[PDB]
Amino acid sequence: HKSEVAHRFKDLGEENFKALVLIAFAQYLQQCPFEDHVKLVNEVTEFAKTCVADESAENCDKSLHTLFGDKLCTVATLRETYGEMADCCAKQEPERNECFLQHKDDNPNLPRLVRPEVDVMCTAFHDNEETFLKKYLYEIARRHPYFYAPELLFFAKRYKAAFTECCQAADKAACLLPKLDELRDEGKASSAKQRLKCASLQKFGERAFKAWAVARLSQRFPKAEFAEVSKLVTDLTKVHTECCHGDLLECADDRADLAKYICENQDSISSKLKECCEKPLLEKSHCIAEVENDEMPADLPSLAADFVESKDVCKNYAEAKDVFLGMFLYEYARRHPDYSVVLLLRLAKTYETTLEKCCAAADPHECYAKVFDEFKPLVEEPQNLIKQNCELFEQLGEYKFQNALLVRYTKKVPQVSTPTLVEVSRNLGKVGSKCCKHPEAKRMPCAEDYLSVVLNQLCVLHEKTPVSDRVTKCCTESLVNRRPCFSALEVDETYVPKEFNAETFTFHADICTLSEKERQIKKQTALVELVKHKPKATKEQLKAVMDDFAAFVEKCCKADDKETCFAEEGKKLVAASQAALG
Length: 582
Ligand SMILES: CCCCCCCCCCCCCC(=O)O
Ligand SMILES: CCCCCCCCCCCCCC(=O)O
Ligand SMILES: CCCCCCCCCCCCCC(=O)O
What we know:
With 582 residues, the protein is an all-alpha fold. The chain has 6 domains: 99 residues, Orthogonal Bundle (Serum Albumin, Chain A, Domain 1), CATH 1.10.246.10; 74 residues, Serum Albumin, Chain A, Domain 1 (Orthogonal Bundle); 87 residues, Serum Albumin, Chain A, Domain 1, CATH 1.10.246; 76 residues, Orthogonal Bundle (Serum Albumin, Chain A, Domain 1), CATH 1.10.246.10; 107 residues, Serum Albumin, Chain A, Domain 1; 80 residues, Serum Albumin, Chain A, Domain 1 (Orthogonal Bundle). Helices cover 71% and strands 0% of the residues. The chain contains 29 helices and no strands. The site of one myristic acid has 15 residues, from helix 27, helix 28 and helix 29. One myristic acid binds next to helix 22, helix 23 and helix 26.
């Protein structure tokens, strides 16, 4: 094209253009204030329009990288605020843009973002929607500089819908706060999932990434032929490699190209792609990535004939081992959309280990005749963990399920900090809540995705502040072994009970009318401290103390003099509990 800035402006339309430009500058210049960025965005937008009017006017024929970089090099506080990043300006393209990318900051040391009160939020949203929404977009972008700009834009539109719905409601806070909860968690997850894929590509390498993609794409597109899946695996891997190592525009072009190839070849790939493929360029790759699994073909045969029974198994394998294993993973995965991806990779690894043994043995065919039997323990372990945890979740409800996990995990790794124990147990409880309301066939994939983000959060915290060799092992294992390493953790027989501290077990009158979350967290914090203090306490003894706690809170929140109730009845409860637990 004559003018890439005009091309993009036309493809995107003014409103998306401006939003994306704001995210771009915020991701590179994480410390500049909102108003400074609004001025850069307006100036870039004004310039873009001249190019749309006449693609031969001044500067309109420069690359986007050239234009973007030039604008960055005009910021007056560049050296003052970003130091060595100003020296990127002494370079030509493409080294200049390379240099700018090296200076982004994953952990920007910015203050926690405060959710204002619901009435303040709705008022700001009514009084100036544009500013309200753009400011939050800016705040999120500068805190997540690698997050894919278009997906950020997809969340922003969901925020807008939530304020539109809930600000005109009768009970604004009870409408909105659950929606904002849901969206913040989905956004945190998406951000963690992206970081995780990039780390894992570097740690475990490209072959392992392709294995993962074969499994994932085959579940999603089970009517596609292996040759088409293999094609998509190769293109997907290239896309991910660039998006991990790359600037926004290179990632965007790679994603747009794959989406277009997919949309042109729907008939070969999936029947569920028509809606997505109608959508505007901006949303297409995203929509595709989130499409539901196609229906698998009817009356597919058993894998036995090709992978066990044939005389030619070792020959077909040795001819090209990764193609054969890829084929095994394709056939297995498309027949089992109810499996986690990591389970399918365990099976593939098991199959490979068996062929490596058996193809060099005296009688290969006899040696690998029972390989499918080796799959059964692998499959049953996650299915049985889901049933047990979902049965417990149905008995207790979310909050008491969380409390069960708090007790469980605190005894297993009592050296972890209380906030971390509380946060991770709370999150695991929310994985239960989400995934146990799916039917059996959808639980294992759901669990896999969401556990992967909770366990990632834990491993991130633990790397920064190590306390347990056992957690370190789980965190540095292969991605396929990570969750079973955590499930295999046992009770810590070596922990020395924390000393009693009375202030830890004191509570105040405000407990009564505080937010549902805030009340829960205060109770769960004390539950963890109780288990840390009394790690040998039995289930019946903890139930008794927990029951007494609940009678104590019920009494004191109905009293007229609440501060004295909490202090006087609080001391009694503590002394009774200490006697019972010994
Ligand atoms: C205590 C958390 C409750 C979440 C629901 C239970 C999940 C059990 C593990 C599922 C297996 C994840 C995928 C895998 O490792 O194959
Ligand atoms: C503090 C570490 C938390 C570990 C979370 C593992 C996720 C799966 C939870 C299912 C219950 C534990 C599995 C088991 O012990 O068999
Ligand atoms: C030995 C000192 C123990 C003091 C007793 C405090 C116990 C913590 C209460 C845990 C919350 C229970 C859950 C609930 O009923 O909401």
